[PDB]
Symmetry: C3
């Protein structure tokens, strides 16, 4: 799984340990080994949410499977809680786009995760 | 709705009220309250369009609904219009990827927009 | 086609000619004319892959068609090769998301591709 956070919170406000905590907590939430998890945090962004430049975040989570109604609600509670506690961003100023990727459409290590056909 | 612009135009060339302008214009175009509109502008990018580093932009518009053939051409005229006028980017050097998101696949406020099941 | 690379490799390590090489090689691999290929490289990113900050890349390739099982494997071999040779990123620390775009969902030049 791959998690990206873009935010107008400044770099100096991102705590030591943030990327490792996201890695661990995502591995736990998705039931996937942490070796697979990629995390990417982009601070100091020029952004508005509702026309206002109070802290906010635009995020994406891409996974092959483990995406769905109940699961995505759990991920949102986890990730919003982390963004609130660590970055001081209000949960109602956060969007997370969830993408259930097909294995054939994820490249890795010179190939893709679809090894069965064609 | 969420609109993201990545561009090689420098930061100093982005006008002070551009984020506010995009917000109001997208609210009107989509018929959604501005409170739901998020805008993200990323200047000074290392990018090329057709092998050239003249001004260009790579963009995305995500919405739950209000995405489709006729609507998207309307969004393209509006957004290219704004990019040309405000950032001085030729419309033929802009790409906009449109995504019609399912409510269940958009997280917000500790949950998603799918409150029904 | 639109190709984006986000990486923690520093800007100073991106070699002269990298965007041109990406453009030319994507044109060759996808068949599409180079005049319409857009490439975007974002270095110096705060990133981890498997919990480690050794060099890594998160990438996307969007194309109207030319996306599929065998074609995507070929793109991955090409693009991981370039990231390995040019940016010194191990291929097993690269993810590439492939998107087959509907022409009505791609804006360009005041309109769409449909
Ligand atoms: O990134 C995008 O928004 C898509 C751009 C694009 C532009 C021209 C093409 O022929 C194509 O397949 C895709």
């Amino acid at each position: 799984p791959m998690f990206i956070v873009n935010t107008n919170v400044p770099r100096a406000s991102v705590p030591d340990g943030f990327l490792s905590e996201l890695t661990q907590q995502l591995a736990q939430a998705t039931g996937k080994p942490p070796q697979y998890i990629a995390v990417h945090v982009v601070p100091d962004q020029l952004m508005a949410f509702g026309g206002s430049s109070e802290p906010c975040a635009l995020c994406s989570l891409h996974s092959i499977g483990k995406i769905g109604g109940a699961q995505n609600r759990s991920y949102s509670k986890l990730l919003c809680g982390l963004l609130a506690e660590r970055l001081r961003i209000s949960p109602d100023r956060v969007y997370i786009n969830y993408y259930d990727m097909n294995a054939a459409n994820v490249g890795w290590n010179n190939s893709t995760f679809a090894l069965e056909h064609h």
